[PDB]
Amino acid sequence: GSHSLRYYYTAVSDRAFGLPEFSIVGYVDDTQSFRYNSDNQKAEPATQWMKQKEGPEYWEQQTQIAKGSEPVHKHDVKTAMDRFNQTSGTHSLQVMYGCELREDNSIRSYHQYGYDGREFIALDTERWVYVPSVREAQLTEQKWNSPEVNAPERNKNYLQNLCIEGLKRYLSYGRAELERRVHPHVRISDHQSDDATELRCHAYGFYPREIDVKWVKNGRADVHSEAAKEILPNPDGSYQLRVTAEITPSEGDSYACHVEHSSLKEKLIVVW
Amino acid sequence: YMMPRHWPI
């Protein structure tokens, strides 16, 4: 139904292997789309369908926004530590924002800072003022909310415009590939024996991410057995799920795996 | 497009 553009910033006080001090990825609704990091400071597409769609103009525009947000964030991680009295240690700061387009003309948005795995400070969407989660984000709350800075009215003008303008535009470019239904192969197996039997029900290769797979005995829902919905991703669009069921105490009789996915009608697979 | 910069915290 709805579609979302959204950006994720991660900034750290000391780098490590794999991590640059600062880096960005932006999702367009499920696909990873944009990328930037502080080693070789450049904004890149991250998916074929963003390649060769916007000119050199754009991108250098984007690389400059990113090269500007980088130092103010390395700075903020050192400031945050100070409000908490920390001198040693590695520390992280995380930023999230995004717009959601939906329904008819409905717009929704969010913008939040997180210092370590804890929410620090965040924007109320109808009131349009930043509300801290913590004492230490009171001094931030006041700088930003003040008349002279007025960050609520600035980000409001981005969240209600540029973000959606850019969303609408990127949805266009990835139109052919974002709705694109691809549907599940399914491969039942049943590990081992002894008294009762295991029964794995492997579905794979599908898009979108959402599915439902039960084990049905004749015409009644079977049993839990562990994990629950662990829909795993593949390194394309595709997704994957496996449901297990400890069964036959001894009686037998016609088990079956009921898949229910957005490319279908029903789909039902029999025993062995 | 991504958000301009933001103030230092």
Binding site: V12, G117, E230, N234, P235 | -
Partner: protein, 94 residues
């Protein structure tokens, strides 16, 4: 601190005799410092390839690493993962 949840698997079902898209997906960890590698009988995998660590609305990072590797019967495939600089932990494919 939030320890990682490691899942290690094949794109398609496992088929001995041929190559396989070996995957391991690590998520729900914080902080983001994370080493990670696939091996086969101890021999590290000559193929590499890793998606970017992002994070969820809970602030907890995830990432994957994939490889095409040939698999016979027997031979263990393993995904070794380390979070902070803590000793590596080994996770077998099935």
């Amino acid at each position: 601190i939030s320890p990682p949840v490691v899942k290690v698997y094949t794109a398609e079902p496992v088929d001995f005799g041929k190559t396989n898209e070996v995957i391991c997906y690590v998520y729900n960890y914080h902080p983001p410092r994370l080493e990670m590698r696939l091996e086969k009988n101890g021999v590290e995998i000559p193929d590499c390839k890793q998606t970017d660590p992002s994070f969820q609305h809970n602030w907890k990072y995830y990432t994957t690493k994939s490889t095409h590797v040939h698999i016979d019967k027997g031979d263990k495939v393993e995904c070794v993962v380390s979070h902070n600089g803590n000793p590596s932990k080994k996770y077998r494919l099935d």
